[PDB]
Amino acid sequence: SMQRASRLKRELHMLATEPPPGITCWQDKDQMDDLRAQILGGANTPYEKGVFKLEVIIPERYPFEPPQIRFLTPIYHPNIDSAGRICLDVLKLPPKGAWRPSLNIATVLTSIQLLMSEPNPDDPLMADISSEFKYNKPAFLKNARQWTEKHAR
Ligand SMILES: COc1ccc(-n2cnnn2)cc1
């Protein structure tokens, strides 16, 4: 679809020239729908000094379906499982999710960045990590810092 291609061209230009702070997103080779991204570990978060790589697949029906995004770098977090799947509203269509064509790759990457800083323990993919975050936050922070040191630095 030509509407999809023109939209992806504009997004790649905006991601190259006005990337959100801490965020980088690029075409892996020669396909505008096979992308990668990088989110820097946030300051005053256990991920600080970590560098986290993600895969960003643009589906056929984009912008009417959300980008398909998974972490390639392991991360220790209530809402991200050990295969890097992400539980986040803007990555799912209504009624459960909040994706709409007014959002874009940069918006949802920023949403992931914020999720890293502020987990949603009510919708976990890792129940035990989530309980740890809710009830033993110092142990969570230490385990998140250790996971970051082993896998993201
Ligand atoms: C609160 O709205 C939600 C939207 C999406 C999820 N998902 C989590 N993992 N896949 N989808 C959970 C809650």
Using an 8 Å Cβ cutoff, are 33 and 62 in contact?
yes
Number of domains in the chain: 1
**CA 92 to CA 88: how far, in whole Å?**
7
Q: Is 25 a catalytic residue?
A: no
Question: Which domain range does residue 36 map to?
Answer: 2-151
Using an 8 Å Cβ cutoff, are 35 and 42 in contact?
no
Query: Which residue among 15, 56, 58, 87 is the active-site one?
Result: 87
Using an 8 Å Cβ cutoff, are 87 and 79 in contact?
yes
User: How many Å lie between the centroid of ligand 1 and the Cα of residue 77?
Assistant: 15
Tell me the C-alpha to C-alpha distance, in Å, between residue 114 and each of 29, 43, 63, 117: 28, 12, 22, 5
DSSP state at residue 14:
H
**CA 132 to CA 121: how far, in whole Å?**
10
Resolution in A: 2.1
Task: Provide the CATH number for the domain around residue 60.
Answer: 3.10.110.10
The crossing angle, in degrees rounded to 10, of helices 127-135 and 137-151 is: 130
**CA 69 to CA 112: how far, in whole Å?**
9
Strands, E, within 4-83: which ranges? 23-27, 34-40, 51-57, 68-71
**CA 146 to CA 153: how far, in whole Å?**
10
Comparing C-alpha atoms, which of 137, 151, 106, 136 is closest to residue 14?
106
**CA 58 to CA 39: how far, in whole Å?**
18
Encode 87-111 in three state secondary structure: CCHHHCCCCCCCCCCCCCHHHHHHH
Q: Catalogue the long-range contacts made by 32-35 (C-beta closer than 8 Å, 24 or more residues apart).
A: 32/5, 32/8, 32/58, 33/8, 33/57, 33/58, 33/59, 33/62, 34/58, 35/105
**CA 15 to CA 2: how far, in whole Å?**
20
Residue whose Cα lies nearest atom 8 of ligand 1: it is 87
